[PDB]
């Protein structure tokens, strides 16, 4: 028994995660990693005999586009239904989220006080001129965030926001989320937007250098007075032509079960989807916050206008 996993997850803990699965079920995991868009293209180009059993992403919107293109097959699992909140899985059992991550404002403690922060929209304020940095618009975390702004504020307003946000950049987008945190820590900028688990990793690192970086940067959950902080998920679905549907289903059921949920929360610093599972202490220290649960099912359709907006605004 084996499954062919196509995953856009890119963490050093993924190997142990999959190992946990095999040690529990005896099912071998053949892994193919790459960026979400690349994996979807590969699957579609490989045809009806593609080896792909499971498609794993770190973005809800890409999962939507995958389901739209009919790449998944329905799965009805009692464990999936009970463990995964309805709003975090496909109404037709096409895909399911198994972790949650928040894209929040991370700021230099010495240069910024929390009282000066509020919403994502405010980051376009002239006050932040030459003090903001963020990774490239090509990244899905950013595209999904911009999509949520389109959904909540509209295309016209988001375009205006993006132009202002870009005008505030201290440097052109370079590096990943962690590179942004380090740059803010080093005084190259005062704030950025990154996923919570990246800060969790730095705070929990055995490398003193990483922990030192974390100490200079604080975390702020935006839009608390309104829709809430933008929350995305790491999701998964069984490919329609999966050669081993049985193993594929067991894999997804494994991901949402207590053992895997606890590991993901404790070792990869993400928010588990299963209730009753404790967060990593460092992540717990961020505090409680309101999550945006209303803009989720409309994010996918908003991808197109979001990317158009990011391009027009000059967000490289
Ligand atoms: Fe990530």
From Swiss-Prot:
This is Iron uptake protein A1. Belongs to the bacterial solute-binding protein 1 family. Disruption phenotype: Cells grow normally in the absence of iron but have a reduced capacity for Fe(3+) uptake; double knockouts of this gene and futA2 (slr0531) grow very poorly in the absence of iron and have a marked reduction in their ability to take up Fe(3+). Fe cation binds at residues 10-11, 141, 197-198. It comes from Synechocystis sp. (strain ATCC 27184 / PCC 6803 / Kazusa). Its main location: membrane. It is a lipid-anchor. It comes from the Bacteria. One of its GO terms (molecular function) is metal ion binding. It holds the Pfam family SBP_bac_8. One of its GO terms (cellular component) is plasma membrane-derived thylakoid membrane. GO terms for biological process: iron ion transport. The keyword Transport applies. InterPro entries: Ferric-bd, SBP. Keywords: Cell membrane, Ion transport, Iron, Iron transport, Lipoprotein, Membrane, Metal-binding, Palmitate, Signal, Thylakoid, Transport.
């Amino acid at each position: 028994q084996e499954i062919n996993l196509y995953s856009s997850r890119h963490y050093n803990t993924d190997n142990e995660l999959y190992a946990k699965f095999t040690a529990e079920t005896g099912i071998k995991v053949n892994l193919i990693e790459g960026k979400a868009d690349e994996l979807l293209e590969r699957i579609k180009s490989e045809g009806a005999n593609s080896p792909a059993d499971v498609l794993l992403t770190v973005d809800l919107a890409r999962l939507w586009r995958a389901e739209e293109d009919g790449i998944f097959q329905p799965v009805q699992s009692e464990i999936l239904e009970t463990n995964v909140p309805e709003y975090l899985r496909s109404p037709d059992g096409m895909w399911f989220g198994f972790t949650k991550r928040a894209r929040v404002i991370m700021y230099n403690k010495g240069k910024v006080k929390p009282e000066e922060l509020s919403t994502y929209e405010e980051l376009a304020d002239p006050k932040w001129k030459g003090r903001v940095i963020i990774r490239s618009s090509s990244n899905e975390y950013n595209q999904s965030l911009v999509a949520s702004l389109v959904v909540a504020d509209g295309e016209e307003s988001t375009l205006a926001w993006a132009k202002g946000f870009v005008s505030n950049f201290a440097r052109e987008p370079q590096g990943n989320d962690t590179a942004q945190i380090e740059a803010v820590s080093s005084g190259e900028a005062d704030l950025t937007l990154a996923n919570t688990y990246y800060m969790g990793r730095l705070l929990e690192s055995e490398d003193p250098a990483q922990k030192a970086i974390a100490e200079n940067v604080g975390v702020f959950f935006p839009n608390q007075e309104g829709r809430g902080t933008h929350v995305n998920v790491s999701g998964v679905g069984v490919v329609k032509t999966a050669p081993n549907r049985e193993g594929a289903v067991k894999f997804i059921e494994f991901l949402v079960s207590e053992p895997a949920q606890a590991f993901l929360a404790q070792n990869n610093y993400e928010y588990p989807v299963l209730a009753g599972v404790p967060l990593n202490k460092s992540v717990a220290s961020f505090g409680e916050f309101k999550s945006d649960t209303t803009s989720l099912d409309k994010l996918g359709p908003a991808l197109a206008p979001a990317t158009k907006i990011m391009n027009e605004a000059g967000w490289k």
